[PDB]
Amino acid sequence: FVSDALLVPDKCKFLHQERMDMCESHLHWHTVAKESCGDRSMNLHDYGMLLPCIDRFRGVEFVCCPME
Amino acid sequence: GSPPGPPTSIHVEEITDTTATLSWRPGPDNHSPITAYTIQARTPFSLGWQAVSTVPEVVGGSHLTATVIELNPWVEYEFRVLASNAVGTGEPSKPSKKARTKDTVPKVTPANVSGGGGSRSELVITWEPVPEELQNGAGFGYVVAFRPFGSTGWMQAAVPSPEASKYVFKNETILPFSPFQVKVGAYNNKGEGPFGPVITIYSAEEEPGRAPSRLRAKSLSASDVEVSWKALKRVLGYELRYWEKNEKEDASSVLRTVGNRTLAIIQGLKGSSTYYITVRAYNTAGTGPPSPVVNITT
């Protein structure tokens, strides 16, 4: 497994999260990213999975960018 | 009238990222009032037992508790206390139970960030992994940033292994032997540390496009032969590939030269035998197409 390289334009932020105890689905890790950009007043423009543990992962990486 | 005895029942009242509050029970004063206490500690990264700084700076004989300061976050410690009277310093106490300090964000960057090499369409980024005593927490990983030199934004990726020392990015947009700006950071469960300074690493180059030509050979002895060819993306040397008449090219031996030497000598051959020899250029991206084969006898 190799983590995806995400594109981070100017004033965007690269974020990531993981927990060696968890083993969650892709859809769960998406909602983690979409909400984290949301309560920062930013949109989700790019994301990928971290640490595979069947279609389940221990982490996520994503990019938030300002709105409008 | 001799030095005092050792304290007993060393206990850790609390522990933080850098401090540890300790308590202990006094031993015999050996007819001389204990004037002060002193504290030592030991980690897997210390040269055995070492003295520590405390608050207060001087732990008096009436003090059965003190705070050790200036510890290393996320490090497993054990402590001991020594009594000291007017006659002299006493025997150390027994070690406390092991206690790991609390964690924090990493304060260091990966050392010796560098890279280069690989096959075409690849960008190789390397770094010296952070040793355990500087990681400052569980879940230690790395963040790698890179971009073509002069670009606006960055490409970034989380590399979660604490022992990760290499990240390889492959893409059809990677131009051969092109410069990239690269910086590598660190992180653990408590947050992210700082990035290192921006360095320039070049992408992988392309293997040689052409074969050497005019391959000729002549024997020097029953086991030694001299091989020469003609010169031609850059080249760092040439690779010989040889096998005897009753063998195949794929199950052969290899020999590599460095530079533009254009000549080479093969040892270890058998006398009165026929061999086949192939010369092939190479750089860091691999080899190019081979030259037409030559046959020589010993």
PDB file of N, CA, C and O in Angstrom, chain B residues 89-148:
ATOM      1  N   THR B  89      27.445  11.524  51.224  1.00  0.00           N
ATOM      2  CA  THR B  89      26.292  11.012  50.494  1.00  0.00           C
ATOM      3  C   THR B  89      26.091   9.529  50.781  1.00  0.00           C
ATOM      4  O   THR B  89      27.049   8.776  50.981  1.00  0.00           O
ATOM      5  N   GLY B  90      24.825   9.112  50.790  1.00  0.00           N
ATOM      6  CA  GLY B  90      24.453   7.768  51.167  1.00  0.00           C
ATOM      7  C   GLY B  90      24.188   6.876  49.972  1.00  0.00           C
ATOM      8  O   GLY B  90      24.402   7.244  48.813  1.00  0.00           O
ATOM      9  N   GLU B  91      23.708   5.671  50.267  1.00  0.00           N
ATOM     10  CA  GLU B  91      23.470   4.691  49.218  1.00  0.00           C
ATOM     11  C   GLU B  91      22.179   5.043  48.471  1.00  0.00           C
ATOM     12  O   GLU B  91      21.243   5.580  49.075  1.00  0.00           O
ATOM     13  N   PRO B  92      22.121   4.815  47.157  1.00  0.00           N
ATOM     14  CA  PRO B  92      20.895   5.134  46.416  1.00  0.00           C
ATOM     15  C   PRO B  92      19.736   4.245  46.827  1.00  0.00           C
ATOM     16  O   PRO B  92      19.915   3.112  47.281  1.00  0.00           O
ATOM     17  N   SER B  93      18.530   4.776  46.648  1.00  0.00           N
ATOM     18  CA  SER B  93      17.323   4.006  46.889  1.00  0.00           C
ATOM     19  C   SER B  93      17.127   2.967  45.788  1.00  0.00           C
ATOM     20  O   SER B  93      17.842   2.938  44.783  1.00  0.00           O
ATOM     21  N   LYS B  94      16.132   2.108  45.988  1.00  0.00           N
ATOM     22  CA  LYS B  94      15.736   1.191  44.936  1.00  0.00           C
ATOM     23  C   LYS B  94      15.000   1.953  43.836  1.00  0.00           C
ATOM     24  O   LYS B  94      14.397   3.000  44.092  1.00  0.00           O
ATOM     25  N   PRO B  95      15.054   1.464  42.598  1.00  0.00           N
ATOM     26  CA  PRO B  95      14.389   2.173  41.499  1.00  0.00           C
ATOM     27  C   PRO B  95      12.878   2.213  41.681  1.00  0.00           C
ATOM     28  O   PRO B  95      12.267   1.290  42.224  1.00  0.00           O
ATOM     29  N   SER B  96      12.278   3.308  41.221  1.00  0.00           N
ATOM     30  CA  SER B  96      10.830   3.391  41.161  1.00  0.00           C
ATOM     31  C   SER B  96      10.302   2.458  40.075  1.00  0.00           C
ATOM     32  O   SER B  96      11.055   1.912  39.265  1.00  0.00           O
ATOM     33  N   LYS B  97       8.986   2.275  40.062  1.00  0.00           N
ATOM     34  CA  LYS B  97       8.367   1.567  38.954  1.00  0.00           C
ATOM     35  C   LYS B  97       8.478   2.402  37.684  1.00  0.00           C
ATOM     36  O   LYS B  97       8.476   3.635  37.723  1.00  0.00           O
ATOM     37  N   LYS B  98       8.597   1.715  36.551  1.00  0.00           N
ATOM     38  CA  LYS B  98       8.784   2.403  35.282  1.00  0.00           C
ATOM     39  C   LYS B  98       7.555   3.231  34.933  1.00  0.00           C
ATOM     40  O   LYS B  98       6.415   2.795  35.119  1.00  0.00           O
ATOM     41  N   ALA B  99       7.795   4.440  34.429  1.00  0.00           N
ATOM     42  CA  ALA B  99       6.726   5.362  34.071  1.00  0.00           C
ATOM     43  C   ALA B  99       7.114   6.105  32.805  1.00  0.00           C
ATOM     44  O   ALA B  99       8.201   6.685  32.730  1.00  0.00           O
ATOM     45  N   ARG B 100       6.227   6.083  31.816  1.00  0.00           N
ATOM     46  CA  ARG B 100       6.461   6.758  30.549  1.00  0.00           C
ATOM     47  C   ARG B 100       5.882   8.166  30.606  1.00  0.00           C
ATOM     48  O   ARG B 100       4.732   8.354  31.015  1.00  0.00           O
ATOM     49  N   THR B 101       6.683   9.149  30.207  1.00  0.00           N
ATOM     50  CA  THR B 101       6.218  10.526  30.185  1.00  0.00           C
ATOM     51  C   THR B 101       5.100  10.700  29.162  1.00  0.00           C
ATOM     52  O   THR B 101       4.933   9.897  28.239  1.00  0.00           O
ATOM     53  N   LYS B 102       4.320  11.763  29.340  1.00  0.00           N
ATOM     54  CA  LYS B 102       3.250  12.062  28.404  1.00  0.00           C
ATOM     55  C   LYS B 102       3.826  12.521  27.068  1.00  0.00           C
ATOM     56  O   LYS B 102       4.985  12.929  26.964  1.00  0.00           O
ATOM     57  N   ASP B 103       2.992  12.451  26.037  1.00  0.00           N
ATOM     58  CA  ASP B 103       3.438  12.705  24.679  1.00  0.00           C
ATOM     59  C   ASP B 103       3.182  14.158  24.276  1.00  0.00           C
ATOM     60  O   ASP B 103       2.503  14.918  24.970  1.00  0.00           O
ATOM     61  N   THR B 104       3.756  14.541  23.140  1.00  0.00           N
ATOM     62  CA  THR B 104       3.530  15.855  22.550  1.00  0.00           C
ATOM     63  C   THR B 104       3.857  15.763  21.065  1.00  0.00           C
ATOM     64  O   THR B 104       4.267  14.713  20.563  1.00  0.00           O
ATOM     65  N   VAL B 105       3.665  16.872  20.360  1.00  0.00           N
ATOM     66  CA  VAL B 105       3.979  16.934  18.936  1.00  0.00           C
ATOM     67  C   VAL B 105       5.483  16.758  18.764  1.00  0.00           C
ATOM     68  O   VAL B 105       6.259  17.122  19.663  1.00  0.00           O
ATOM     69  N   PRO B 106       5.940  16.194  17.648  1.00  0.00           N
ATOM     70  CA  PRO B 106       7.385  16.073  17.431  1.00  0.00           C
ATOM     71  C   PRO B 106       8.014  17.440  17.216  1.00  0.00           C
ATOM     72  O   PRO B 106       7.432  18.317  16.574  1.00  0.00           O
ATOM     73  N   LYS B 107       9.208  17.618  17.771  1.00  0.00           N
ATOM     74  CA  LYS B 107       9.903  18.896  17.704  1.00  0.00           C
ATOM     75  C   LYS B 107      11.029  18.908  16.681  1.00  0.00           C
ATOM     76  O   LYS B 107      11.684  19.941  16.511  1.00  0.00           O
ATOM     77  N   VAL B 108      11.265  17.796  15.990  1.00  0.00           N
ATOM     78  CA  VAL B 108      12.369  17.694  15.050  1.00  0.00           C
ATOM     79  C   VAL B 108      11.824  17.357  13.670  1.00  0.00           C
ATOM     80  O   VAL B 108      10.707  16.857  13.511  1.00  0.00           O
ATOM     81  N   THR B 109      12.631  17.644  12.672  1.00  0.00           N
ATOM     82  CA  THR B 109      12.373  17.272  11.296  1.00  0.00           C
ATOM     83  C   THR B 109      13.197  16.049  10.932  1.00  0.00           C
ATOM     84  O   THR B 109      14.222  15.770  11.563  1.00  0.00           O
ATOM     85  N   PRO B 110      12.775  15.280   9.930  1.00  0.00           N
ATOM     86  CA  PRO B 110      13.598  14.149   9.483  1.00  0.00           C
ATOM     87  C   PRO B 110      14.943  14.631   8.962  1.00  0.00           C
ATOM     88  O   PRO B 110      15.022  15.568   8.165  1.00  0.00           O
ATOM     89  N   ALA B 111      16.005  13.984   9.429  1.00  0.00           N
ATOM     90  CA  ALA B 111      17.352  14.368   9.044  1.00  0.00           C
ATOM     91  C   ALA B 111      17.684  13.859   7.646  1.00  0.00           C
ATOM     92  O   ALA B 111      17.139  12.853   7.182  1.00  0.00           O
ATOM     93  N   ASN B 112      18.581  14.581   6.974  1.00  0.00           N
ATOM     94  CA  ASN B 112      19.164  14.154   5.701  1.00  0.00           C
ATOM     95  C   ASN B 112      18.094  13.875   4.646  1.00  0.00           C
ATOM     96  O   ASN B 112      18.118  12.850   3.962  1.00  0.00           O
ATOM     97  N   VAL B 113      17.141  14.801   4.519  1.00  0.00           N
ATOM     98  CA  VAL B 113      16.190  14.718   3.421  1.00  0.00           C
ATOM     99  C   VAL B 113      16.952  14.818   2.110  1.00  0.00           C
ATOM    100  O   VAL B 113      17.754  15.737   1.905  1.00  0.00           O
ATOM    101  N   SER B 114      16.729  13.850   1.228  1.00  0.00           N
ATOM    102  CA  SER B 114      17.392  13.797  -0.069  1.00  0.00           C
ATOM    103  C   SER B 114      16.583  12.866  -0.965  1.00  0.00           C
ATOM    104  O   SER B 114      15.444  12.507  -0.645  1.00  0.00           O
ATOM    105  N   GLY B 115      17.164  12.475  -2.091  1.00  0.00           N
ATOM    106  CA  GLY B 115      16.476  11.576  -2.997  1.00  0.00           C
ATOM    107  C   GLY B 115      17.133  11.580  -4.367  1.00  0.00           C
ATOM    108  O   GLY B 115      18.289  11.973  -4.516  1.00  0.00           O
ATOM    109  N   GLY B 116      16.362  11.138  -5.348  1.00  0.00           N
ATOM    110  CA  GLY B 116      16.826  10.971  -6.706  1.00  0.00           C
ATOM    111  C   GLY B 116      16.892   9.504  -7.103  1.00  0.00           C
ATOM    112  O   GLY B 116      16.874   8.595  -6.268  1.00  0.00           O
ATOM    113  N   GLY B 117      16.968   9.281  -8.407  1.00  0.00           N
ATOM    114  CA  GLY B 117      17.031   7.935  -8.931  1.00  0.00           C
ATOM    115  C   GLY B 117      15.665   7.361  -9.244  1.00  0.00           C
ATOM    116  O   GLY B 117      14.635   8.043  -9.233  1.00  0.00           O
ATOM    117  N   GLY B 118      15.670   6.063  -9.534  1.00  0.00           N
ATOM    118  CA  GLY B 118      14.467   5.343  -9.902  1.00  0.00           C
ATOM    119  C   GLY B 118      14.351   5.150 -11.402  1.00  0.00           C
ATOM    120  O   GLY B 118      15.203   5.569 -12.193  1.00  0.00           O
ATOM    121  N   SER B 119      13.262   4.488 -11.789  1.00  0.00           N
ATOM    122  CA  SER B 119      12.945   4.288 -13.193  1.00  0.00           C
ATOM    123  C   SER B 119      12.209   5.503 -13.743  1.00  0.00           C
ATOM    124  O   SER B 119      11.673   6.324 -12.994  1.00  0.00           O
ATOM    125  N   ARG B 120      12.184   5.610 -15.072  1.00  0.00           N
ATOM    126  CA  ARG B 120      11.530   6.751 -15.700  1.00  0.00           C
ATOM    127  C   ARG B 120      10.087   6.843 -15.227  1.00  0.00           C
ATOM    128  O   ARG B 120       9.453   5.831 -14.908  1.00  0.00           O
ATOM    129  N   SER B 121       9.592   8.081 -15.147  1.00  0.00           N
ATOM    130  CA  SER B 121       8.269   8.423 -14.626  1.00  0.00           C
ATOM    131  C   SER B 121       8.175   8.309 -13.108  1.00  0.00           C
ATOM    132  O   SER B 121       7.066   8.275 -12.564  1.00  0.00           O
ATOM    133  N   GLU B 122       9.309   8.280 -12.408  1.00  0.00           N
ATOM    134  CA  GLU B 122       9.327   8.187 -10.956  1.00  0.00           C
ATOM    135  C   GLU B 122      10.072   9.356 -10.323  1.00  0.00           C
ATOM    136  O   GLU B 122      11.007   9.919 -10.904  1.00  0.00           O
ATOM    137  N   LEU B 123       9.645   9.703  -9.106  1.00  0.00           N
ATOM    138  CA  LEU B 123      10.318  10.678  -8.255  1.00  0.00           C
ATOM    139  C   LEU B 123      10.542  10.026  -6.900  1.00  0.00           C
ATOM    140  O   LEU B 123       9.584   9.581  -6.262  1.00  0.00           O
ATOM    141  N   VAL B 124      11.797   9.964  -6.464  1.00  0.00           N
ATOM    142  CA  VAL B 124      12.171   9.248  -5.248  1.00  0.00           C
ATOM    143  C   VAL B 124      12.560  10.264  -4.181  1.00  0.00           C
ATOM    144  O   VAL B 124      13.440  11.106  -4.401  1.00  0.00           O
ATOM    145  N   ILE B 125      11.908  10.178  -3.021  1.00  0.00           N
ATOM    146  CA  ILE B 125      12.164  11.060  -1.889  1.00  0.00           C
ATOM    147  C   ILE B 125      12.546  10.201  -0.692  1.00  0.00           C
ATOM    148  O   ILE B 125      11.820   9.264  -0.339  1.00  0.00           O
ATOM    149  N   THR B 126      13.680  10.519  -0.070  1.00  0.00           N
ATOM    150  CA  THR B 126      14.190   9.753   1.059  1.00  0.00           C
ATOM    151  C   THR B 126      14.511  10.684   2.221  1.00  0.00           C
ATOM    152  O   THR B 126      14.601  11.906   2.067  1.00  0.00           O
ATOM    153  N   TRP B 127      14.689  10.085   3.396  1.00  0.00           N
ATOM    154  CA  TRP B 127      15.027  10.822   4.606  1.00  0.00           C
ATOM    155  C   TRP B 127      15.482   9.828   5.664  1.00  0.00           C
ATOM    156  O   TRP B 127      15.145   8.641   5.609  1.00  0.00           O
ATOM    157  N   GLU B 128      16.252  10.326   6.625  1.00  0.00           N
ATOM    158  CA  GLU B 128      16.652   9.507   7.761  1.00  0.00           C
ATOM    159  C   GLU B 128      15.501   9.442   8.756  1.00  0.00           C
ATOM    160  O   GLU B 128      15.009  10.491   9.186  1.00  0.00           O
ATOM    161  N   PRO B 129      15.035   8.254   9.131  1.00  0.00           N
ATOM    162  CA  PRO B 129      13.895   8.168  10.048  1.00  0.00           C
ATOM    163  C   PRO B 129      14.242   8.711  11.424  1.00  0.00           C
ATOM    164  O   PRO B 129      15.383   8.628  11.885  1.00  0.00           O
ATOM    165  N   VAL B 130      13.235   9.281  12.074  1.00  0.00           N
ATOM    166  CA  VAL B 130      13.443   9.912  13.382  1.00  0.00           C
ATOM    167  C   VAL B 130      13.640   8.830  14.439  1.00  0.00           C
ATOM    168  O   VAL B 130      12.815   7.902  14.534  1.00  0.00           O
ATOM    169  N   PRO B 131      14.700   8.896  15.243  1.00  0.00           N
ATOM    170  CA  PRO B 131      14.889   7.894  16.298  1.00  0.00           C
ATOM    171  C   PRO B 131      13.790   7.990  17.346  1.00  0.00           C
ATOM    172  O   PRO B 131      13.100   9.005  17.477  1.00  0.00           O
ATOM    173  N   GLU B 132      13.638   6.903  18.107  1.00  0.00           N
ATOM    174  CA  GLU B 132      12.476   6.763  18.982  1.00  0.00           C
ATOM    175  C   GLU B 132      12.408   7.875  20.023  1.00  0.00           C
ATOM    176  O   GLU B 132      11.326   8.410  20.296  1.00  0.00           O
ATOM    177  N   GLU B 133      13.551   8.251  20.604  1.00  0.00           N
ATOM    178  CA  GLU B 133      13.549   9.218  21.698  1.00  0.00           C
ATOM    179  C   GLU B 133      13.179  10.629  21.254  1.00  0.00           C
ATOM    180  O   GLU B 133      13.032  11.506  22.111  1.00  0.00           O
ATOM    181  N   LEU B 134      13.027  10.875  19.954  1.00  0.00           N
ATOM    182  CA  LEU B 134      12.631  12.185  19.460  1.00  0.00           C
ATOM    183  C   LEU B 134      11.244  12.184  18.833  1.00  0.00           C
ATOM    184  O   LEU B 134      10.758  13.251  18.439  1.00  0.00           O
ATOM    185  N   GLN B 135      10.589  11.022  18.742  1.00  0.00           N
ATOM    186  CA  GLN B 135       9.275  10.951  18.109  1.00  0.00           C
ATOM    187  C   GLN B 135       8.197  11.615  18.960  1.00  0.00           C
ATOM    188  O   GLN B 135       7.242  12.181  18.414  1.00  0.00           O
ATOM    189  N   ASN B 136       8.325  11.541  20.285  1.00  0.00           N
ATOM    190  CA  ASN B 136       7.461  12.233  21.239  1.00  0.00           C
ATOM    191  C   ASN B 136       6.026  11.724  21.242  1.00  0.00           C
ATOM    192  O   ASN B 136       5.133  12.421  21.730  1.00  0.00           O
ATOM    193  N   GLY B 137       5.764  10.528  20.722  1.00  0.00           N
ATOM    194  CA  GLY B 137       4.418   9.997  20.830  1.00  0.00           C
ATOM    195  C   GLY B 137       4.111   8.796  19.962  1.00  0.00           C
ATOM    196  O   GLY B 137       4.845   8.493  19.019  1.00  0.00           O
ATOM    197  N   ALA B 138       3.017   8.107  20.278  1.00  0.00           N
ATOM    198  CA  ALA B 138       2.590   6.969  19.485  1.00  0.00           C
ATOM    199  C   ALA B 138       1.973   7.436  18.170  1.00  0.00           C
ATOM    200  O   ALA B 138       1.664   8.616  17.975  1.00  0.00           O
ATOM    201  N   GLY B 139       1.783   6.481  17.263  1.00  0.00           N
ATOM    202  CA  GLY B 139       1.267   6.799  15.944  1.00  0.00           C
ATOM    203  C   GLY B 139       2.173   7.703  15.144  1.00  0.00           C
ATOM    204  O   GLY B 139       1.686   8.522  14.356  1.00  0.00           O
ATOM    205  N   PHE B 140       3.484   7.580  15.329  1.00  0.00           N
ATOM    206  CA  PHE B 140       4.426   8.465  14.660  1.00  0.00           C
ATOM    207  C   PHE B 140       4.491   8.143  13.171  1.00  0.00           C
ATOM    208  O   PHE B 140       4.631   6.979  12.778  1.00  0.00           O
ATOM    209  N   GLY B 141       4.375   9.180  12.344  1.00  0.00           N
ATOM    210  CA  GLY B 141       4.460   9.035  10.904  1.00  0.00           C
ATOM    211  C   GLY B 141       5.117  10.237  10.259  1.00  0.00           C
ATOM    212  O   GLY B 141       5.697  11.076  10.953  1.00  0.00           O
ATOM    213  N   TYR B 142       5.028  10.340   8.935  1.00  0.00           N
ATOM    214  CA  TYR B 142       5.664  11.419   8.195  1.00  0.00           C
ATOM    215  C   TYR B 142       4.701  11.996   7.170  1.00  0.00           C
ATOM    216  O   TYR B 142       3.773  11.329   6.710  1.00  0.00           O
ATOM    217  N   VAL B 143       4.943  13.253   6.810  1.00  0.00           N
ATOM    218  CA  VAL B 143       4.224  13.926   5.735  1.00  0.00           C
ATOM    219  C   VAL B 143       5.248  14.404   4.716  1.00  0.00           C
ATOM    220  O   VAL B 143       6.199  15.113   5.071  1.00  0.00           O
ATOM    221  N   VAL B 144       5.059  14.013   3.458  1.00  0.00           N
ATOM    222  CA  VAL B 144       5.983  14.347   2.381  1.00  0.00           C
ATOM    223  C   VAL B 144       5.299  15.328   1.441  1.00  0.00           C
ATOM    224  O   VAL B 144       4.158  15.103   1.025  1.00  0.00           O
ATOM    225  N   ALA B 145       5.998  16.411   1.105  1.00  0.00           N
ATOM    226  CA  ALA B 145       5.511  17.409   0.164  1.00  0.00           C
ATOM    227  C   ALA B 145       6.491  17.548  -0.993  1.00  0.00           C
ATOM    228  O   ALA B 145       7.710  17.549  -0.787  1.00  0.00           O
ATOM    229  N   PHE B 146       5.959  17.668  -2.209  1.00  0.00           N
ATOM    230  CA  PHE B 146       6.806  17.813  -3.387  1.00  0.00           C
ATOM    231  C   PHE B 146       6.020  18.479  -4.506  1.00  0.00           C
ATOM    232  O   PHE B 146       4.787  18.437  -4.539  1.00  0.00           O
ATOM    233  N   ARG B 147       6.763  19.084  -5.434  1.00  0.00           N
ATOM    234  CA  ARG B 147       6.199  19.783  -6.582  1.00  0.00           C
ATOM    235  C   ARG B 147       7.293  20.057  -7.606  1.00  0.00           C
ATOM    236  O   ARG B 147       8.475  20.128  -7.242  1.00  0.00           O
ATOM    237  N   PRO B 148       6.957  20.198  -8.885  1.00  0.00           N
ATOM    238  CA  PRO B 148       7.956  20.665  -9.852  1.00  0.00           C
ATOM    239  C   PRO B 148       8.459  22.044  -9.457  1.00  0.00           C
ATOM    240  O   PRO B 148       7.687  22.904  -9.026  1.00  0.00           O
TER     241      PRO B 148
END
